[PDB]
Design a protein around this nucleic acid. Structure first.
Ligand SMILES: [Mg+2]
Ligand SMILES: [Mg+2]
Ligand SMILES: [Mg+2]
Ligand SMILES: [Mg+2]
Ligand SMILES: [Mg+2]
Ligand SMILES: [Mg+2]
Ligand SMILES: [Mg+2]
Ligand SMILES: [Mg+2]
Ligand SMILES: [Mg+2]
Ligand SMILES: [Mg+2]
Ligand SMILES: [Mg+2]
Ligand SMILES: [Mg+2]
Ligand SMILES: [Mg+2]
Ligand SMILES: [Mg+2]
Ligand SMILES: [Mg+2]
Ligand SMILES: [Mg+2]
Ligand SMILES: [Mg+2]
Ligand SMILES: [Mg+2]
Ligand SMILES: [Mg+2]
Ligand SMILES: [Mg+2]
Ligand SMILES: [Mg+2]
Ligand SMILES: [Mg+2]
Ligand SMILES: [Mg+2]
Ligand SMILES: [Mg+2]
Ligand SMILES: [Mg+2]
Ligand SMILES: [Mg+2]
Ligand SMILES: [Mg+2]
Ligand SMILES: [Mg+2]
Ligand SMILES: [Mg+2]
Ligand SMILES: [Mg+2]
Ligand SMILES: [Mg+2]
Ligand SMILES: [Mg+2]
Ligand SMILES: [Mg+2]
Ligand SMILES: [Mg+2]
Ligand SMILES: [Mg+2]
Ligand SMILES: [Mg+2]
Ligand SMILES: [Mg+2]
Ligand SMILES: [Mg+2]
Ligand SMILES: [Mg+2]
Ligand SMILES: [Mg+2]
Ligand SMILES: [Mg+2]
Ligand SMILES: [Mg+2]
Ligand SMILES: [Mg+2]
Ligand SMILES: [Mg+2]
Ligand SMILES: [Mg+2]
Ligand SMILES: [Zn+2]
Lengths: 204, 74, 147, 96, 123, 60
RNA sequence: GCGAAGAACCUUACCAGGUCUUGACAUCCUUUGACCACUCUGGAGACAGAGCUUUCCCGGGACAAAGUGACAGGUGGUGCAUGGUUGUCGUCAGCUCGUGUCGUGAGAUGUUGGGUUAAGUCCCGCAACGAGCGCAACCCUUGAUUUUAGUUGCCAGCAUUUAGUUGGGCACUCUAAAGUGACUGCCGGUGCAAGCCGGAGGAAGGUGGGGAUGACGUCAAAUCAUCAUGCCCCUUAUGACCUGGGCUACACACGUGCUACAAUGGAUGGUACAAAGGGUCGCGAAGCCGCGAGGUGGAGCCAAUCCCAUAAAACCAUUCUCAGUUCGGAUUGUAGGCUGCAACUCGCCUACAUGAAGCCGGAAUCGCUAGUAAUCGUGGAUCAGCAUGCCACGGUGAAUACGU
């Protein structure tokens, strides 16, 4: 028996969608762009610890507010990437592309960013058990009421695959009022696929 | 066309037969009342089965005569 | 049910001659939700049974009660790694349930043309202590008589 | 004598937004036809779960469209001026 | 008055009169052929002794022919009781102010019907 | 013989009938819902994450 | 009745024949510039040959053509190498931790024992006292009700028209946002208590009915053919382009459905009551031609308004009178309609004709505990067209549960 996606069933009861853009008979054009204008942003600012890119469009102009854990890397004193990506995002959407970054707080609460701390490390040939436990205790200081990191795949360079994980504390999934996050990344090692999974119960 | 407002040959079988063995490649081009006495070769997925368009077999789709599955007993 | 007993409902007093032996045998009549087909028939059978017999249709319909109600139902008791015929005394459940089943299950034996009279003839036929429905009751007690 | 139609997916965002213009309508004009409900459209998409066989497992998503319309009874010059000057939450549908 | 059952609803206005139980701008015996099922509609008027004392006006929407019969019975049983509170002590016992809660059932995927299922064969 | 054929879906054929529809992220031929242009497996995998607005799980 | 929520072509991965090589399809570069689209001949087309030809924008910029390669390109292999995503045990009631205590020790206790429950649910008794993920609850829909807003819905008070049509009003319904209501709450017996048996009241009584939600893990379970990936193999062919064909073949055996074998029925005419959905380059009305499937016509509609859209079982009269028939409808001939470049292999439907097995099915086997099974219709997804299947919606509405 396989779980549900603890986001995929919290949507619309305690959390909105990653896109707020009404459309009348033009959804197919808008929706396909809300899946590719989120791909150029995915690689151009890949190292800037971007977690959510909530695209909102209205009146023939689009707004994509990129929320990052390294706010000064995308925009700031350089003032160039924001203008530089204003050319690339607008060269695809064929209209205005206004982006306003949002600065993250308590970086060990965003699961995508939290599991990229264990997705590069494992790709650098580190221990599976050490990699998760060194950071599971690390993020546990921040204030998360729970954690569960698992690193599933052909772990440890063996010829037979097996599963590994960890935990600490409370993380009730079956309660619908839980503010639970989730993320899943690809540990593209030199030998195969080993994708990790991380999620974080939070305040209430 | 099974509708009474139509009757079509392929594009060229009628043209080649108009001047004029005949090997019209594909199929489907029912023998009208202007081709009795000019044998054609309607292809069959392999080889060219020879059929001689007589006066009786007029109207029928050209393909019908050449079978496609070889079943010589169980 | 593997947990205790249950009690049944079968209760909705009918419009004409309000009773539950006439909303029952009117529910053990229909097929695939055909309440209307049966209800008219079950009132036309009374119409012919109230004329060709004379007495009250309800008393004539209930006259065939003691002639169809079974007394001993041969039970299939498991003894010696098999099943045998151990007779027992039927309860009120298998009395009226069986009893009203006997008629309709024997509605192919009146041999009429329409079910309006066929159900009307059988009730009278058992009400005469004759016919097959009463014979069927006597037949059941016969196999129960052997054991 | 105008008519505005609201079509938003979440009933909270639109019914709050309609509660704003209906207030601005009262200031612009006493004669206001307040917010009013219309039946909500539902659609269902029964996509199948497994990547391959096992035909008996699927998962059903839905997509509502909550609707509300606001009109004007005996409007004034303020209606034309004071209506277009508002921006509603992204998702609310405006059509006058 | 107002009475539902299944997908049908019936709204009843009850005023004193001869006793003609009109239904939906037509005579009731025209509107219901099988009068034997229409006698239960008099249960909210025979359990309390007010059979031919009021003329019953009805409005009908939806359901099926038997579908209103349960709703009109209830739809008046909540109005005769409102005429005088003395009627409740017997109209609230026969089973008349109660609203039948049974309704048709959703069809669940993987099943032919609501509760049925495919046919099963082992090997 | 797969990534060749997406060009066959894209290019305008010599007869309207030849033209069919396939998923706009992975060119899966079967089960493409026209309101989205996504196959069954793309459509569900985005709905969980939440790219498609309005769509949510339907208890009933 | 499995991937396939649509195999004429296409899709198509397969066969035959015919054709291409940096390739049909990407990134690195250069010489040209916006390249195309169009007509004529041949061919089955794939492709060759002729012409006007594509008038770029601001040295730079997008897009393209032509020139050799780095490369591409594999629905080619290994699910006993993998990410995934799933299934079944199973919505079964389990899986553990901290502090104490017993044991030299792995370990044990808590979590065993008596009742109770849908449930390690709850109580009592014990060297244990507590807690976390699972159960229950939070969430959705149906059953009663308050307030709010009353149109495109509703029509009582008023009349008005063939018609709720018209003024006019949000009274009732109904739509939809915020609330109330049910918790063994009260009474009797019983129990020590948990609870169990019954009664009032209430729309609703014992988690009211139904969804969503699937713990620790099992099957080296399914999928390299959704996407991605370790390693291998082909890389002027195991890659690529077209036309035809196969995917629908038949001497047979098995799984899931449809239609019947008749009087609770057929035939003829009349005639009544739904719920839930879909519609813009789309739904397509009225009239007109038709037995006919349909064609012409274009009203109203970006829809609580108009359309798809007359629901059938039921009911009321006449006829049939227990026959392989006034049941059944396969099969075949002729004659037709629709879409599509094209209905022969191989689509759907209509009329006339033809009229076959079947007269309630052997041993055995399947589903369902109430609006359930059974039975009669309607809508959607895919969709130029094609569904007895799938996903949803309603109408008529049963039978029995002693017991393991
Ligand atoms: Mg394991
Ligand atoms: Mg959650
Ligand atoms: Mg054979
Ligand atoms: Mg499931
Ligand atoms: Mg009361
Ligand atoms: Mg079931
Ligand atoms: Mg097609
Ligand atoms: Mg198959
Ligand atoms: Mg594997
Ligand atoms: Mg296999
Ligand atoms: Mg199962
Ligand atoms: Mg010790
Ligand atoms: Mg245990
Ligand atoms: Mg349970
Ligand atoms: Mg639960
Ligand atoms: Mg409820
Ligand atoms: Mg109220
Ligand atoms: Mg009001
Ligand atoms: Mg009680
Ligand atoms: Mg419940
Ligand atoms: Mg439930
Ligand atoms: Mg389920
Ligand atoms: Mg294992
Ligand atoms: Mg395995
Ligand atoms: Mg196997
Ligand atoms: Mg393969
Ligand atoms: Mg993938
Ligand atoms: Mg992908
Ligand atoms: Mg096949
Ligand atoms: Mg087939
Ligand atoms: Mg079979
Ligand atoms: Mg019969
Ligand atoms: Mg018939
Ligand atoms: Mg509707
Ligand atoms: Mg019919
Ligand atoms: Mg019928
Ligand atoms: Mg016949
Ligand atoms: Mg024949
Ligand atoms: Mg024949
Ligand atoms: Mg004959
Ligand atoms: Mg016949
Ligand atoms: Mg024959
Ligand atoms: Mg059950
Ligand atoms: Mg749809
Ligand atoms: Mg099929
Ligand atoms: Zn896809």
């Amino acid at each position: 028996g396989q779980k549900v996606h603890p986001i995929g069933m919290r949507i619309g009861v305690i959390r909105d969608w990653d896109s707020k853009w009404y459309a009348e008979k033009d959804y197919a054009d808008f929706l396909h762009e809300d899946l590719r204008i989120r791909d150029y942003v995915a690689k151009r600012l890949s190292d800037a610890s971007v977690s959510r890119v909530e695209i909102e469009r209205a009146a023939n102009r689009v707004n994509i507010t990129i929320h990052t854990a390294k706010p000064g890397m995308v925009i700031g004193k350089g003032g160039s990437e924001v203008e530089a990506l204003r050319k690339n995002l607008n060269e695809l959407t064929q209209k205005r592309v206004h982006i306003n970054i949002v600065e993250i707080k308590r970086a060990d609460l965003d699961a995508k960013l939290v599991a990229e701390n264990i997705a590069r490390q494992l790709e650098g040939r580190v221990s599976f058990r050490r990699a998760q436990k060194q950071a599971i205790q690390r993020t546990m200081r921040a204030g998360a009421k729970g954690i569960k990191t698992q690193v599933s795949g052909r772990l440890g360079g063996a010829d037979i695959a097996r599963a590994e994980h960890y935990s600490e504390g409370t993380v009730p999934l079956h309660t619908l009022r839980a503010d639970i996050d989730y993320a899943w990344e690809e540990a593209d090692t030199t030998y195969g696929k080993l994708g990790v999974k991380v999620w974080i119960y939070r305040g209430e | 066309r099974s509708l009474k407002k139509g009757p079509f040959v392929d594009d060229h079988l009628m043209k080649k037969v108009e001047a004029a063995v005949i090997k019209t490649w594909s199929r489907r081009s029912t023998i009208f009342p202007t081709f009795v006495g000019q044998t054609i070769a309607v292809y069959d997925g392999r080889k060219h089965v020879p059929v001689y368009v007589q006066e009786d077999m007029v109207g029928h789709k050209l393909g019908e005569f050449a079978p496609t599955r070889t079943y010589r007993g169980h | 049910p593997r947990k205790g007993p249950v009690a049944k409902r079968d209760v909705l007093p009918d419009p004409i001659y309000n009773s539950k032996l006439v909303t029952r045998l009117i529910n053990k009549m229909m097929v695939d939700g055909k309440r209307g087909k049966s209800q008219a028939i079950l009132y036309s059978a009374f119409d012919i049974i109230a004329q060709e017999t004379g007495k009250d249709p309800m008393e004539v319909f209930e006259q065939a009660m003691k002639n169809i109600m079974p007394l001993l139902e041969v039970k299939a008791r498991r003894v010696g790694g098999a099943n045998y015929q151990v007779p027992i005394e039927v309860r009120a459940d298998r009395r009226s349930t069986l009893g009203l089943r006997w008629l309709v299950n024997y509605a192919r034996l009146r041999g009429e043309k329409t079910m309006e009279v066929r159900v009307a003839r059988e009730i009278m036929d058992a009400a005469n202590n004759t016919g097959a429905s009463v014979k069927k009751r006597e037949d059941t007690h016969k196999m129960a008589d052997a054991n | 004598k105008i008519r505005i139609r609201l079509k938003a997916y979440d009933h909270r965002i639109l019914d709050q937004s309609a509660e704003k213009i209906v207030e601005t309508a009262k200031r612009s004009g006493a004669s206001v036809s307040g917010p009013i409900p219309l039946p909500t459209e539902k659609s269902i998409y029964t996509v199948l779960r497994a990547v391959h066989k096992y035909k008996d497992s699927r998962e059903q998503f839905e997509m509502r469209t909550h609707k509300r319309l606001i009109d004007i009874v005996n409007p004034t010059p303020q209606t034309v001026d004071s209506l277009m000057r508002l921006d509603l939450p992204s998702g609310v549908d405006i059509e006058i | 008055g107002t009475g539902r059952r299944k997908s049908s609803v019936a709204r009843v206005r009850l005023v004193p009169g001869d006793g003609k139980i009109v239904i939906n701008n037509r005579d009731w015996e025209d509107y219901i052929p099988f009068a034997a099922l229409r006698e239960v509609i008099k249960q909210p008027l025979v359990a309390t002794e007010t059979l031919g004392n009021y003329d019953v006006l009805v409005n009908v929407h939806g359901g099926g022919y038997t579908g209103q019969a349960g709703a009109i019975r209830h739809g008046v049983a909540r109005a005769l009781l409102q005429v005088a509170p003395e009627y409740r002590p017997a109209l609230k016992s026969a089973g008349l102010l109660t609203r039948d809660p049974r309704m048709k059932e959703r069809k669940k995927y993987g099943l032919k019907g609501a509760r049925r299922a495919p046919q099963f064969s082992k090997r | 013989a797969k990534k060749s054929m997406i060009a066959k879906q894209k290019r305008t054929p010599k007869y309207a009938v030849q033209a069919y529809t396939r998923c706009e992220r992975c060119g899966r031929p079967h089960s493409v819902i026209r309101k989205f242009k996504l196959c069954r497996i793309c459509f569900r995998e985005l709905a969980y994450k939440g790219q498609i607005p309005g769509v949510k799980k339907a208890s009933w």
